Design a protein around this nucleic acid. Structure first.
Length: 65
DNA sequence: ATGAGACGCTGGCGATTAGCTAATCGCCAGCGTCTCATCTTTATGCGCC
């Protein structure tokens, strides 16, 4: 509940998360999203901008060209 | 019109009585796993201001 430097999970509500209301209190979408975005790097040329996935068709066209 | 001033075995034993770190070495050290993802980075391979 905002007291750990290792957490990223977002609470839809603000209750003590139990195995029955786990699906409702925890935003599984935003938790997985924040989980992966916190590990991916940023573009060295464009610092504040993120990076496209490895299977992007535009990115394959880029490396091919 | 007299009655104070002058003070010991200790030292050298035993024998209680009491009490304390230190030097040497040996032992022996919580550890087991998996999942999941995440990023890097390296070996080789390709380009001239």
């Amino acid at each position: 509940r905002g007291n750990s430097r290792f957490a990223w999970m977002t609470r839809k509500s603000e209750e003590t998360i139990t195995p029955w209301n786990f699906e409702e209190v925890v935003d599984k979408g935003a938790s997985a999203q924040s989980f992966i975005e916190r590990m991916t790097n940023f573009d060295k040329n464009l610092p504040n901008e993120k990076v496209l996935p490895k299977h992007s068709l535009l990115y394959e066209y880029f490396t091919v060209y």
